[PDB]
Amino acid sequence: TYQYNMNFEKLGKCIIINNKNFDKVTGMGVRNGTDKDAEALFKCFRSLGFDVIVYNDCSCAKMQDLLKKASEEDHTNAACFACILLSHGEENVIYGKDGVTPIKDLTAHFRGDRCKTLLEKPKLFFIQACRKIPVEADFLFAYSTVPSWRGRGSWFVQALCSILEEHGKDLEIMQILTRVNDRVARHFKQIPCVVSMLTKELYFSQ
Amino acid sequence: TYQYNMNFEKLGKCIIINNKNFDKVTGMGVRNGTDKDAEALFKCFRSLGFDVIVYNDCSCAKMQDLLKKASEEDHTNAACFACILLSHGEENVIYGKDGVTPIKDLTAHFRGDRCKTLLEKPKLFFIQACRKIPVEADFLFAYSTVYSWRGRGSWFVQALCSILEEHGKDLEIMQILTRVNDRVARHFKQIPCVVSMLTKELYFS
Ligand SMILES: O=C(O)c1ccccc1Sc1ccccc1S(=O)(=O)N[C@]12C[C@H]3C[C@H](C[C@H](C3)C1)C2
Secondary structure, eight states, X not given: OOBOOOOSSBXXXXXXXXXXXXXXXXXXXXXXXXXXXXXXXXXXXXXXXXXXXXXXXXXXXXHHHHHHHHHHSOOTTBSOEEEEEESOEETTEEXXXXXXXXXXXXXXXXXXXXXXXXXXXXXEEEEESOOOOOSSTTEEEEESSOOOOOOOOOHHHHHHHHHHHHHTTTSOHHHHHHHHHHHHHXXXXXXXXXXXXXXXXXXXXX | OOBOOOOSSBOEEEEEEEOOOOOTTTOOOOOTTHHHXXXXXXXXXXXXXXEEEEEESOOHHXXXXXXXXXXXXXXXXXXXXXXXEEEXXXXXXXXXXXXXXXXXXXXXXXXXXXXGGGTTSOEEEEEEEEOOOOXXXXXXXXXXXXXXXXXXXOHHHHXXXXXXXXXXXXXXXXXXXXXXXXXXXXXXXXXXXXXXOOOSBOOOO
16 A cells, blocks of 8 residues: 555666766766775665666766666566666766766656656666656655765765665665665765655565 | 654744745735645644744745744754745745745755754755755755645645644654655646655654
């Protein structure tokens, strides 16, 4: 009634996009520790139940392509869809190897009026970068820093993954991300932000 | 450990700001039924434990001031502090009688480096736009929209109050708001947004 329904063949796709290396032209730098964060995330979301795919040094044009192609896929048998972005960022834009794409444009592909197969199911978006059913319902964003600090990993992620490894299967999504906020805030300063359009409670299990 | 602490003399002040009437020179419109919502809200946050106070048709002047005066008060005996805005809106700006004041201005007053006594305590902001602890930690915003549609109440408020009317004292803040995001979407379509920098679970008891 109040859980999001999990009685699905699969938990879902989980697209990690690990941009470490950027063209000189951007002025952005090699992002060190991102590899440690893709691994943490890759493994954590494997354990959860997600069919993880890690993209690497992904270009703005292939960030926009692979998410569109992922939204055109059939999700009829998936409980949700996660997507995880590990790049550089500015107000309302994630970076690629060749430039910047608006984050809203990347997520738009999974809107209800486009990705009918992910209707009524959580669309999760986690971002580590420096900054008659409605369509935008059943979305959720976890940005690393309120409008992002990290070779020994990054704070938001080291923490996100710690918390999923233990309570990931026994705690609601907001209970988790909240605990990730306290962890980042106390020590790991910055504070992570969480936007929820979710209309139900998201447990990754039973 | 993981719940926010409520063992305080008071739950906190709750400033409701009910802009129904907007000046001619300003171009904004009557938001009619905001008084049904403000009252709806007055009772809900009254039952919860809040010292709700309703100011009506404020100036952008009065708002930024009225929130500055509020941040400077003493909360050592308060568990949190609530605030509710019922005006017209556009992007990162709230409206008044004389114009618009950016919302960051209203909230900044309660940042960790300003209001030492509401530190590590929930700062709650509910907003209906019709059309080593960090500084920005422990705020929560509930916008009514990501338009926002409304006499006879408005959808966002109607639901928020219903859900609190019952589950206010036995449900975490995010669970409540998650239900308020469901009712607004299905029963009526638009969707409310919820921003949490909370670092703990917020129960009103
Ligand atoms: O500094 C505080 O006032 C502040 C204090 C505590 C929490 C957040 C903030 S900011 C703020 C305040 C109110 C509502 C939303 C935000 S926000 O988290 O989304 N931050 C921005 C930062 C810039 C100015 C304005 C519009 C846009 C760009 C986003 C607020």
